[PDB]
Amino acid sequence: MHLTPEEKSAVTALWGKVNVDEVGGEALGRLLVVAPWTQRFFESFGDLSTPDAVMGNPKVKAHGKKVLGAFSDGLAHLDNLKGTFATLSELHCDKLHVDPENFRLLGNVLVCVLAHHFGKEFTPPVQAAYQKVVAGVANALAHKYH
Amino acid sequence: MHLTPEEKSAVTALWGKVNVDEVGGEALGRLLVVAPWTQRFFESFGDLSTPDAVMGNPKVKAHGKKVLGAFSDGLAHLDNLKGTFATLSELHCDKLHVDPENFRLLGNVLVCVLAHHFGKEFTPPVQAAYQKVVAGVANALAHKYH
Amino acid sequence: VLSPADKTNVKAAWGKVGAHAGEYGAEALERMFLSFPTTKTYFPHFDLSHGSAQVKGHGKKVADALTNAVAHVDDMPNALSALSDLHAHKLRVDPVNFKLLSHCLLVTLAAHLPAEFTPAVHASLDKFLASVSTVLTSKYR
Amino acid sequence: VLSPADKTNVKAAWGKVGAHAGEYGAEALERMFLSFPTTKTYFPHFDLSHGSAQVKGHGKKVADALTNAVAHVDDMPNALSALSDLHAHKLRVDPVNFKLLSHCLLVTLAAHLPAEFTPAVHASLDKFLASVSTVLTSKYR
Ligand code: HEM
Ligand code: HEM
Ligand code: HEM
Ligand code: HEM
Numbered sequence: 001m002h003l004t005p006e007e008k009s010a011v012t013a014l015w016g017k018v019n020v021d022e023v024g025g026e027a028l029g030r031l032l033v034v035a036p037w038t039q040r041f042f043e044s045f046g047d048l049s050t051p052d053a054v055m056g057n058p059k060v061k062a063h064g065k066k067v068l069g070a071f072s073d074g075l076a077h078l079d080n081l082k083g084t085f086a087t088l089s090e091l092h093c094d095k096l097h098v099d100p101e102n103f104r105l106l107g108n109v110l111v112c113v114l115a116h117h118f119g120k121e122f123t124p125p126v127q128a129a130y131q132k133v134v135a136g137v138a139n140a141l142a143h144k145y146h
Numbered sequence: 147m148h149l150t151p152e153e154k155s156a157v158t159a160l161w162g163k164v165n166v167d168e169v170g171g172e173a174l175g176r177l178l179v180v181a182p183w184t185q186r187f188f189e190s191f192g193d194l195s196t197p198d199a200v201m202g203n204p205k206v207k208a209h210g211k212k213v214l215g216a217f218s219d220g221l222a223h224l225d226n227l228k229g230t231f232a233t234l235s236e237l238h239c240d241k242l243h244v245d246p247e248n249f250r251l252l253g254n255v256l257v258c259v260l261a262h263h264f265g266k267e268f269t270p271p272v273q274a275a276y277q278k279v280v281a282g283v284a285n286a287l288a289h290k291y292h
Numbered sequence: 293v294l295s296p297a298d299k300t301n302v303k304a305a306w307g308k309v310g311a312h313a314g315e316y317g318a319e320a321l322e323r324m325f326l327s328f329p330t331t332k333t334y335f336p337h338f339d340l341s342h343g344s345a346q347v348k349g350h351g352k353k354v355a356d357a358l359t360n361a362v363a364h365v366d367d368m369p370n371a372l373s374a375l376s377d378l379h380a381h382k383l384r385v386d387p388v389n390f391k392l393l394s395h396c397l398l399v400t401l402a403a404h405l406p407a408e409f410t411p412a413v414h415a416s417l418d419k420f421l422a423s424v425s426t427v428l429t430s431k432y433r
Numbered sequence: 434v435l436s437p438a439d440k441t442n443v444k445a446a447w448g449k450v451g452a453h454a455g456e457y458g459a460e461a462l463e464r465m466f467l468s469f470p471t472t473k474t475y476f477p478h479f480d481l482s483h484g485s486a487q488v489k490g491h492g493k494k495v496a497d498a499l500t501n502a503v504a505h506v507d508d509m510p511n512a513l514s515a516l517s518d519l520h521a522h523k524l525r526v527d528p529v530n531f532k533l534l535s536h537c538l539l540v541t542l543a544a545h546l547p548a549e550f551t552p553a554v555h556a557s558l559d560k561f562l563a564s565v566s567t568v569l570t571s572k573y574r
Pocket of ligand 4: 472475476491494495498499516520524526530531532534535565566569
């Protein structure tokens with residue numbers, strides 16, 4: 001986490017304008033659509049057969065909001081991500097069996113989602129701060145795998 | 147590093163048996179052959195037109211020895227690879243323009259060379275510790291890129 | 293492989309790019325430079341400063357090539373042969389970097405086409421950029 | 434694209450594996466599980482302990498499929514249709530992982546076929562495993 005103060009202010013300013021409910025659903029849904037293999041973890045979510053079925057599935061929307069919820073909390077402890085995400089890392093490893101590469105895919109999708117939403121406001125340099133952040137979070141989520 | 151005393155001992159002890167002269171020339175030469183595109187940095191070395199020509203090229207062999215040497219010395223600062231490769235990290239970035247991905251290609255070749263050499267001796271648990279060292283070296287070397 | 297659907301998607305989204313391709317190409321590059329500084333090692337000879345004409349110049353060439361692959365969506369291997377040759381033999385860019393540029397191109401398009409950048413279109417553009425990258429890397433060994 | 438030299442080298446190398454492919458299959462898995470513990474996420478239902486019969490058997494299965502691939506080196510896509518299906522629609526292993534197994538398999542051959550694991554043979558086997566990986570992940574989307 002080589003977030004320069006200026007990088008951290010930038011992450012934080014934009015995060016201020018996000019509707020976590022909304023972004024969460026879009027990021028998650030979009031992942032299931034761009035990398036359909038990731039659907040392996042959600043066969044109890046029902047119909048993921050088409051983009052509309054995925055994007056609109058109440059379960060995907062509810063789960064996305066959960067995920068971004070946890071991510072948001074993450075952004076308030078940019079200093080202690082590993083600590084922050086520890087029990088979650090254990091859970092994904094030991095109970096859920098989620099390959100950590102999944103965490104990086106979601107980070108990239110998330111970045112495209114922010115670009116989608118903020119247009120011109122998601123500047124080259126803001127994107128670079130968010131790149132460091134999604135990466136820090138994925139790493140923190142993978143820290144307890146064994 | 148996140149090496150276990152046991153893991154530290156295993157690395158350390160196999161290394162003791164290494165002919166850096168021979169292993170350095172073979173690791174670098176194999177690289178130039180398996181991943182032909184790394185040859186972009188060694189045009190001044192001569193003809194690398196064939197496995198034979200690469201494996202035979204003295205310039206290659208001698209560069210290989212310089213590289214494993216530096217690596218070898220890094221094994222003595224396994225608890226601060228970062229500080230040991232700082233200057234070498236800047237150099238690679240600022241002077242040579244070597245993409246850090248290359249550091250990872252070599253590491254994997256290094257591991258294939260060790261296995262090649264030690265057969266039986268290079269057990270799963272021993273490769274595992276070596277994989278952690280090669281990843282650690284690559285990260286250290288890439289650390290000062292900007 | 294790209295499906296009829298994908299093909300339609302790509303022609304459509306790229307259609308909208310129109311005359312901004314050049315500028316979007318320049319922007320994808322700058323984003324790439326800023327987010328993945330390791331990609332810079334391939335451009336030691338460039339002025340990578342903000343508004344560098346070298347980058348503008350280069351963004352345009354990248355954009356023309358993408359535009360050419362869209363025009364020949366059914367024969368990309370042949371439409372891009374030359375560029376495949378150049379990259380394999382001269383530039384020798386490590387393959388991992390294609391995915392980085394791909395990614396920055398997707399961010400750029402998303403930042404400019406909110407209306408078209410639907411989930412379905414996003415997926416198609418991603419498969420497309422991946423196929424372009426595969427062609428450009430096909431002759432590496 | 435596998436050159437004729439390549440197809441030759443592969444068949445030779447694999448030729449020497451002989452009755453041991455199964456053991457090499459098993460050994461590669463074990464090396465993968467230890468070196469890249471994240472790969473274990475795909476086998477929660479296995480006993481991943483040393484010498485597990487689940488691992489040995491899986492090892493054989495993998496080994497056999499490679500054999501079949503060497504045998505149909507000219508028609509991989511076809512010889513592995515079913516397997517590409519299984520991986521894309523049921524297993525859905527993430528693509529990064531194929532590179533990890535491919536690497537543990539080189540290491541294993543290297544450690545067992547010293548004389549035969551020449552620089553040119555090494556290059557070939559690598560392309561080969563690469564090709565095999567491409568084939569197994571071709572229907573992902
Ligand atoms: C930013 C990365 C992520 C964060 C912060 C996150 C957070 C969470 C949280 C807070 C939960 C609920 C914990 C509980 O049930 O006690 C959860 C569950 C889950 N996560 Fe993650 N997650 C992340 C990424 C992912 C990804 C990328 C996948 C799959 C590709 C995934 C798969 C799952 C699954 C399958 C569940 C359980 C769902 C159920 O209740 O059936 N997560 N995650
Ligand atoms: C294990 C990782 C590596 C280590 C420890 C390492 C170390 C070194 C050292 C000690 C030098 C000597 C230069 C000096 O002090 O002036 C050097 C030079 C160089 N290295 Fe690296 N290196 C590594 C990986 C690589 C790779 C993978 C490549 C390209 C494939 C590379 C390309 C070069 C080049 C082109 C030079 C300059 C040689 C010359 O001056 O002709 N290095 N490296
Ligand atoms: C789909 C992705 C890519 C496309 C379509 C593309 C296309 C092109 C084209 C059209 C050119 C100019 C050739 C000429 O002079 O006519 C070029 C040059 C070049 N590209 Fe690629 N490229 C791609 C990916 C990459 C990546 C990922 C990198 C490195 C990070 C890269 C590095 C270079 C370099 C260093 C040059 C030469 C620039 C100069 O000296 O003017 N390319 N590329
Ligand atoms: C070198 C490329 C690979 C080949 C040729 C291969 C081949 C196979 C074969 C032949 C089977 C058994 C099919 C059956 O049960 O009828 C299989 C199953 C499976 N493979 Fe792949 N595989 C490869 C790569 C991978 C990788 C890298 C992973 C994950 C790290 C993986 C995960 C699995 C799993 C989880 C199963 C099912 C295990 C079970 O429940 O028995 N495979 N594969």
